[PDB]
Amino acid sequence: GLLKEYEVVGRKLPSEKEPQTPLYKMRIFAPDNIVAKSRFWYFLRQLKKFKKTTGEIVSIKQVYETSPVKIKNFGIWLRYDSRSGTHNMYREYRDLTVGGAVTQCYRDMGARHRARAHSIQIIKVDSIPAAKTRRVHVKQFHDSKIKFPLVQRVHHKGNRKLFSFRKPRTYFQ
């Protein structure tokens, strides 16, 4: 998916010896609105007693990133597990929204580390302002303004005529 964001609260069904259980909350980025409903149990089973089904999942809430037109960059903390070197991890990826900032982060983490999705827990997402990105492949884009003639195309290759007549001559300056 495009990794939309849901916040989620659990219940721990209201058993009479102590009613009104404390209702802990997560922040789940997830490929679907159907799948975070059984990912929340995977996060919750690290801390409290609380096993499905001794608890309910009161409202998942899709939340709608607030500032899409601005280009604010985020850092993510991270827990990858490769072959046996499970770890802590900090990265960032400069994206438009937060929901695009986790699809890309998965599909970099699966791209250089192989790091399947069953070993990643998005433990924290912070909106980093500036000046604390380590991240040499990012913060060279902080430098507004920039001349940047990195002339690319899609390279749609090339197009329709599979026996053309006109010599496709990229550079065109």
């Binding site: 290759k157 599979l162 026996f163 006109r166 496709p168």
Partner: protein, 205 residues
């Protein structure tokens, strides 16, 4: 003239690779081809000058152990090392797989009216369209020489003959194409000839 799509397709090979040309022209050739591929001496291959030599020395090592005019018939001219990618792709043990290799000629030394009939381009085949920078690449007309084609220079005694002969022909048509627009000054006041096309093509016409 006519054929099933045209009478022919003749493909220049500067940067038109071996692999992503064959794999197009093979699939084309079971659909009405009548094609031919020329100027074969500067096709390209991945790896390099010494590496994809060693692609061609596994299959030159492969004799046929018992009667070696029995099996593998290698071919040293760089025409029919094109063809070595167009034999795998057509299942030549049917009497239909062989119903394209009588359509298909492959040339190297551009004679024989595939020198005046107009050549074309196929896009994905271009070395300038699927190979990035700094990844080196071998060249067929200066590899197959050093796996033994005896005419790497015997083309050039005639290739420069035609490349000198093509100089004056473009100069034969240089001022003659220029004579057209010189004659086009005498025609813009024919009766009222031009507004039908300045409304139609009419940008530079």
């Amino acid at each position: 003239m006519t054929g099933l799509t045209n009478r022919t397709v003749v493909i220049d090979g500067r940067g038109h690779l071996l692999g992503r040309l064959a794999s197009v022209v093979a699939k084309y050739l079971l659909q009405g081809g009548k094609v031919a591929v020329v100027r074969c001496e500067e096709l390209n291959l991945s790896g390099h000058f010494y590496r994809n030599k060693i692609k061609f020395l596994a299959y030159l090592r492969k004799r046929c152990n018992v009667n070696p005019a029995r099996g593998p018939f290698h071919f040293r001219a760089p025409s029919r090392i094109f063809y070595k990618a167009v034999r795998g792709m057509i299942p030549h043990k049917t009497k239909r797989g062989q119903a394209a290799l009588a359509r298909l000629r492959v040339f190297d030394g551009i004679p024989s009216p595939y020198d005046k009939r107009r050549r074309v381009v196929v896009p994905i085949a271009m070395r300038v369209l699927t190979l990035r920078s700094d990844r080196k690449y071998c060249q067929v007309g200066r590899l197959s020489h050093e796996v033994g084609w005896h005419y790497q220079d015997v083309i050039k005694s005639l290739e420069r003959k035609r490349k000198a002969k093509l100089r004056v022909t473009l100069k034969h048509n240089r001022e003659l194409k220029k004579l057209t627009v010189k004659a086009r000054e005498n025609i813009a006041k024919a009766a009222e000839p031009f507004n039908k096309i300045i409304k139609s093509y009419g940008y530079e016409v």
